[PDB]
Design goal:
2 copies of one chain form a homodimer.
Chain A (H helix, E strand, L loop, with lengths): L1 H26 L5 H11 L6 H12 L4 H23 L15 H4 L2 H22 L6 H15 L4 H11 L7 H24 L7 H28 L4 H4 L2 H18 L8 H11 L5
Helix pairs in contact in A: 1-3, 1-13, 2-6, 3-4, 3-9, 4-6, 4-9, 7-9, 8-9, 9-10, 10-12
């Protein structure tokens, strides 16, 4: 009943987000029609939009304008999707397929896949700088754009993916290195949802900052724990380092920490709690 | 004296730029050894890099802080370098050699080339945001970064390179289309040198703005004319297939002449840039 109301809040965020991306793409001057077509193809591959959903939900918690959350969600989804297209390339993960359809470089060509990835990374910065300027002071525009580029660059995602491709091949890798790799590759951009939202206000409570930072950290880690779990149950991963009921144990523990950090917000977090329960339920076998 | 006073000014600007890049690179947390190794391999070479110099020389003309200039020029080279690494890949221009040495994917692998390119693009923006913020008002920081990201993205460089690959294969390309493709691919980024420099000041005069913009448009165009002139004559569709030898030679000359005359508002203050322009012109003249 209130499960029904909460799922609809999430669904309305998803549909709002996807509509906003269409409008945004249409508003950009793109002299090469192949870039426009491949961008659309890439951006609409059936992604679950978890990074936008988190931006809206965490943004609701601290009452930022949904117009602002529209910009931030778009930026992150563009960044995330650029990385997917590049990761799919033959030189990296070499994925012929993404979900149902062929992957970007198969539906178009490799050059187009590379260039589109390059363009979406830039577009995400363009979108923040041009559309956050009328809604927010310039120092706030700088601060949140900083967060994205810190997390996505050589200090984060770029190093993390490099290490994902090189290190995981051999069996010299420790749990500590695996955790570090995943924190850089996925963990930091998941964090960036919460950091970019927090950087919309001047002075947020330190208890609120810490609660969202705890949720972000532990949700980002546990997704990967869940991914490795599912991979093997439905060379070295979380499934190699932990056994069946041990990796299961880790899943529940990190979800509980994530759940507990939201107790501060009480009623206001019921939709985020509901999302967290669905995400946890992806492994309820 | 003055034929070597201004010549050494150009030499000193490369040295300053390379030294600023090293310091910058050695400060960022780069958790992957492959990344910091390939970054350093790609970013440092012999000879001079034209975009940072143009930033320095245009920045001098309107007397902006040289600390600011270091940052803008670094971000520009990082953006330029990322694009070269990506264009060098087998999916695109397929270059085994960048200049004289093996390209980034040949010295390392294609994944490292893609990723380092990806990280350089992000770094250029990081450098702009963190380093300009104690020096300039936040509004200017935003507008400076806007210029680079508009010129480098899908409305500019990315469409420019996509159309360079798909359309130039055909020989049905007009002079009009060829001029548009090169403006999107390189023209806008070269123009960004002058435009990012202009966004450092609050009340720049429109006669100054227009004088830089004219130099920028004609210089970015004529480099590509020179490139097409060079690798056909001295050592598909190009400027060298659409213009003949003598026509191209005059097109080179006229566009450089327009570029020279654009700086006469500055006068003797521009003598550094004029000598560089004449140096850039004469790598087409050495055939004659």
């Amino acid at each position: 009943n209130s499960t029904q109301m909460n799922k609809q809040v999430i669904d309305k965020y998803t549909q709002r987000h996807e509509l906003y991306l269409e409008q945004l793409l249409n508003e950009i001057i793109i002299p090469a029609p192949q870039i426009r077509s491949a961008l659309h193809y890439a951006l609409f591959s059936g992604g679950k939009r978890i990074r936008p959903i988190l931006v809206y939900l965490a943004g609701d918690l601290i009452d930022v304008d949904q117009g602002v959350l529209d910009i931030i969600a778009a930026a992150l989804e563009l960044t995330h999707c650029y990385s997917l297209i590049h990761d799919d390339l033959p030189a990296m993960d070499n994925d012929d397929l993404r979900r149902g359809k062929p992957s970007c470089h198969k539906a178009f060509d490799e050059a187009t896949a590379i260039l589109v990835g390059d363009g979406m990374q830039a577009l995400a910065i363009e979108v923040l700088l041009m559309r956050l300027s009328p809604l927010l002071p310039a120092a706030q525009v700088v601060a949140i754009t900083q967060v994205l580029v810190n997390a996505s660059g050589i200090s984060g995602m770029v190093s993390g993916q490099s290490l994902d491709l090189s290190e995981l091949a051999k069996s010299s890798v420790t749990e500590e290195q695996l955790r570090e790799i995943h924190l850089l590759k996925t963990g930091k951009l998941i964090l960036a949802c919460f950091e970019m939202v927090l950087a919309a206000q001047h002075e947020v409570s330190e208890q609120i900052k810490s609660a969202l930072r705890t949720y972000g950290k532990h949700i980002g880690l546990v997704f990967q724990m869940q991914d490795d779990y599912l991979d093997l149950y439905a060379k070295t991963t979380f499934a190699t380092l932990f056994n069946k009921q041990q990796l299961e144990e880790e899943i529940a523990v990190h979800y509980q920490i994530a759940m507990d950090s939201l107790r501060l917000f009480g009623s206001k977090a019921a939709a985020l709690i509901e999302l967290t329960k669905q995400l946890q339920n992806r492994s309820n076998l």
